[PDB]
Design an enzyme around this catalytic site. Structure first.
Site, short mmCIF file in Angstrom:
data_model
loop_
_atom_site.label_atom_id
_atom_site.label_comp_id
_atom_site.label_asym_id
_atom_site.label_seq_id
_atom_site.Cartn_x
_atom_site.Cartn_y
_atom_site.Cartn_z
N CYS A 74 -5.99 -2.36 2.67
CA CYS A 74 -6.00 -2.24 4.14
C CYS A 74 -7.19 -3.07 4.65
O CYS A 74 -7.40 -4.20 4.19
CB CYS A 74 -5.98 -0.79 4.55
SG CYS A 74 -5.30 -0.51 6.22
N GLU A 115 0.82 -1.21 0.00
CA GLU A 115 0.00 0.00 0.00
C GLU A 115 0.86 1.26 0.00
O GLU A 115 1.76 1.42 0.83
CB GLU A 115 -0.93 0.00 1.21
CG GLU A 115 -1.76 1.25 1.39
CD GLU A 115 -2.64 1.15 2.61
OE1 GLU A 115 -2.42 0.24 3.44
OE2 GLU A 115 -3.57 1.98 2.76
N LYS A 145 -9.24 3.05 -3.45
CA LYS A 145 -9.83 2.58 -2.20
C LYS A 145 -11.23 3.16 -2.01
O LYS A 145 -11.44 4.36 -2.19
CB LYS A 145 -8.92 2.98 -1.03
CG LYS A 145 -9.42 2.58 0.36
CD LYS A 145 -8.22 2.14 1.20
CE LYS A 145 -8.33 2.51 2.66
NZ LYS A 145 -9.00 1.48 3.49
C1 LIG Z 1 -17.71 7.53 17.48
C2 LIG Z 1 -16.93 7.24 18.75
C3 LIG Z 1 -15.57 6.64 18.44
C4 LIG Z 1 -14.65 6.69 19.66
C5 LIG Z 1 -13.30 7.32 19.36
C6 LIG Z 1 -12.41 6.49 18.44
C7 LIG Z 1 -11.11 7.24 18.10
C8 LIG Z 1 -10.04 6.32 17.50
C9 LIG Z 1 -10.46 5.79 16.15
C10 LIG Z 1 -9.58 5.65 15.14
C11 LIG Z 1 -8.12 6.00 15.31
C12 LIG Z 1 -7.47 6.35 13.97
C13 LIG Z 1 -6.67 5.18 13.38
C14 LIG Z 1 -5.66 5.71 12.36
C15 LIG Z 1 -4.88 4.56 11.72
C16 LIG Z 1 -4.08 5.06 10.51
C17 LIG Z 1 -4.63 4.51 9.19
C18 LIG Z 1 -4.18 5.42 8.06
O1 LIG Z 1 -4.06 6.63 8.26
O2 LIG Z 1 -3.87 4.88 6.74
C19 LIG Z 1 -4.00 5.66 5.54
C20 LIG Z 1 -2.82 6.60 5.36
O3 LIG Z 1 -2.95 7.67 6.31
C21 LIG Z 1 -2.84 7.18 3.94
O4 LIG Z 1 -1.82 6.56 3.12
CL LIG Z 2 1.01 4.49 4.69
#
Ligand SMILES: CCCCCCCC/C=C\CCCCCCCC(=O)OC[C@H](O)CO
Ligand SMILES: [Cl-]
Ligand SMILES: CCCCCCCCCCCCCCCC(=O)O
Ligand SMILES: CCCCCCCCCCCCCCCC(=O)O
Ligand SMILES: CCCCCCCCCCCCCCCC(=O)O
Ligand SMILES: CCCCCCCCCCCCCCCC(=O)O
Ligand SMILES: CCCCCCCCCCCCCCCC(=O)O
Ligand SMILES: CCCCC
Length: 494
Positions: free
Chosen positions: A374, A264, A332
């Site tokens: 992913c 990816e 995606k």
């Molecule tokens: C509604 C209540 C929900 C309660 C609160 C939950 C908060 C935490 C959730 C997610 C954390 C984020 C995860 C981020 C992981 C990274 C994935 C990513 O960014 O991959 C793509 C890249 O950025 C481009 O190439």
């Molecule tokens: Cl990445």
């Protein structure tokens, strides 16, 4: 004694049986733990007022999600850069949010079916579990992580997935666990015997080979595990290193691997900025008999003079001559909330664009691959809806570096294997540093390379053909059964 009658006691016990379920999944893979954990949820909610049961169901899920997805801490505590105590609280609140569906399930089932009965436990319970897990996986773009069917990828219920999908395994596990719990609480053997028969009944299904291998279409496949560190992955000063790493790993394989796969966003730069590198690589690949499939970011100028930025896979080389205007690509469709877009666009004081929900298979060197990026690979129905009969291999590429050295990438990987069994095709899975492997059309591991290493998995893999019953129908047969159960269960207790 009567200690177990205390609501707070049942809540503490709810945490332990809940957290016990995490052991069902990878890397632990003790699949009997799922039945343990589901029996606790089924029994600890018996003979409770509906709001007490909803609390128990909530606390059970807080043990699951609290022990099972706390790895999101690493992503959070690195992506979004907050204090640490704060990233802990976010993991709690995500574990709290998911536990609402498991509290919803317990409350409604206590409210509609208060008696300790097989009706509540084997008929109402799985139909309601089908619905609540459905909502947990759809609301706010969902998060259907940790579904117990996936822990059967190597278990006796395996042969259900090509018939009715992994969610039918969820449905049967909740049913089987309910009667086991019913048997113990009411010290009666009949639900014990029923629970066994139903658990054993799918056993011969794993004898049905739904697919036909095509040995004449066998090719050699390389997948380059580049191992580009996440702290440096998108650094705007070491793209050349990334480009040299993947290219140098690929060149010696040209003319010998028909298909080469970079994970990816392996090319960590816009597609439009890399035309000379791509045009040059394409001719080289074509000069040999080889084809390359790679992730990349495409900031694509739309008609309205603004940019749509996609998370994309492009194809080069033999049988797929590269072109910025080519149709041999995949954007995606399902984006990671927070990581790829800010959920809820109603706010104001960026966000990736989405490709279409259904996209044609990529085509590389005469081979058709159905792609997912992913955790798209965990959306069983979305994968099945893109699947075509002419598909040769399932393809997923992922950068699991965000989850570090935790159980996260193992859970993700286990779910991707379920797709290979369901649609009965090989699964090519290509990652930055973690869990790059080839899955056979029955969910077996044909090849994998160790995590956290720079190397290439190269192996021969045979495409298969034929339609499983689940590939022909998707989820609708199980839904009809859950509607029948739901209609039936509600008819008595109402
Ligand atoms: C509604 C209540 C929900 C309660 C609160 C939950 C908060 C935490 C959730 C997610 C954390 C984020 C995860 C981020 C992981 C990274 C994935 C990513 O960014 O991959 C793509 C890249 O950025 C481009 O190439
Ligand atoms: Cl990445
Ligand atoms: C009587 C209750 C039986 C259950 C026994 C307790 C099992 C607890 C679960 C242990 C491992 C769960 C995963 C936690 C590790 C992690 O967060 O990486
Ligand atoms: C060491 C603790 C392990 C056992 C934990 C399981 C306890 C489950 C309690 C079941 C509730 C049943 C109370 C009355 C229900 C009925 O007979 O209708
Ligand atoms: C709306 C928000 C509620 C839905 C639950 C959030 C999902 C957390 C995503 C876990 C991180 C995985 C990252 C990845 O695979 O790219
Ligand atoms: C997908 C699971 C199989 C579905 C088959 C349809 C009807 C089976 C329903 C289960 C019967 C449970 C009866 C328990 C008997 C008892 O409590 O003694
Ligand atoms: C009491 C001893 C009996 C031993 C078992 C004999 C019959 C078992 C059947 C095994 C078939 C396995 C099918 C594998 C799937 C495939 O063919 O791809
Ligand atoms: C249902 C809208 C998506 C925000 C997470």
């Amino acid at each position: 004694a009567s200690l177990i009658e205390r609501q707070r006691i049942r809540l503490l016990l709810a945490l332990l049986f809940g957290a016990c379920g995490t052991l069902a999944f990878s890397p632990y893979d003790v699949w009997p733990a799922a039945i343990i954990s589901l029996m606790g949820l089924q029994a600890l909610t018996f003979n409770r007022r509906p709001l007490q049961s909803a609390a128990i169901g909530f606390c059970w899920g807080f043990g699951l999600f609290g022990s099972g997805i706390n790895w999101v801490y690493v992503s959070i505590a690195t992506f979004g850069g907050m204090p640490g105590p704060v990233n802990i609280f976010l993991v709690v609140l995500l574990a709290a949010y998911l536990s609402l569906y498991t509290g919803l399930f317990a409350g409604v089932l206590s409210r509609l079916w208060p008696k300790t009965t097989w009706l509540r436990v084997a008929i109402a319970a799985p139909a309601l579990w089908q619905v609540t897990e459905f909502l947990r996986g759809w609301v706010l773009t969902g998060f259907p992580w940790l579904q117990f069917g996936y822990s059967q990828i190597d278990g006796p219920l395996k042969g259900l997935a090509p018939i009715m999908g992994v969610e039918a395994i969820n449905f049967l596990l909740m049913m089987v666990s309910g009667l086991l719990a019913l048997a113990l609480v009411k010290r009666n053997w009949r639900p014990l015997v029923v629970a066994v028969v139903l658990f054993a009944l799918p056993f011969p299904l794993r004898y049905i080979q739904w697919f036909t291998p095509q040995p004449e279409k066998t090719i050699q496949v390389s997948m380059v595990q580049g191992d580009i560190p996440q702290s440096l992955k998108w650094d705007e000063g070491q793209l050349l290193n990334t480009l040299k790493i993947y290219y140098n790993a690929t060149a010696p394989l040209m003319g010998k691997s028909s298909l080469i796969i970079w994970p990816e966003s392996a090319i960590t730069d816009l597609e439009i900025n890399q035309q000379p590198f791509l045009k040059a690589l394409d001719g080289e690949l074509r000069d040999k008999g080889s084809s390359l499939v790679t992730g990349i970011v495409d900031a694509r100028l739309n008609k309205q003079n603004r940019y749509d930025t996609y998370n994309t896979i492009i194809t080069l080389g033999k049988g797929a001559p590269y072109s910025y205007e080519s149709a041999d690509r995949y954007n995606k469709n399902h984006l990671v909330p927070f990581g790829e877009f800010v959920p809820l666009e109603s706010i104001l004081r960026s966000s990736f664009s989405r490709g279409p929900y259904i996209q044609p298979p990529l085509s590389a060197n005469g081979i058709e691959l159905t792609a997912a990026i992913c955790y798209e690979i965990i959306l069983g129905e979305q994968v099945r809806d893109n699947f075509r009969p002419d598909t040769d291999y399932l393809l997923t590429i992922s950068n699991d570096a965000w989850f570090g050295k935790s159980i996260g990438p193992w859970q993700h990987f286990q779910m991707a294997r379920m797709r290979a069994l369901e649609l009965a095709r090989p699964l090519l899975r290509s990652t930055n540093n973690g869990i790059t492997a080839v899955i056979g059309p029955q969910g077996e591991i044909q090849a994998m390379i160790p995590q956290f290493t720079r190397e290439v998995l190269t192996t021969n893999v045979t495409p298969t053909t034929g339609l499983t019953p689940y590939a022909r129908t998707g989820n609708w047969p199980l839904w009809v059964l859950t509607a029948l159960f739901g209609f039936a269960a509600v008819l008595m207790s109402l």
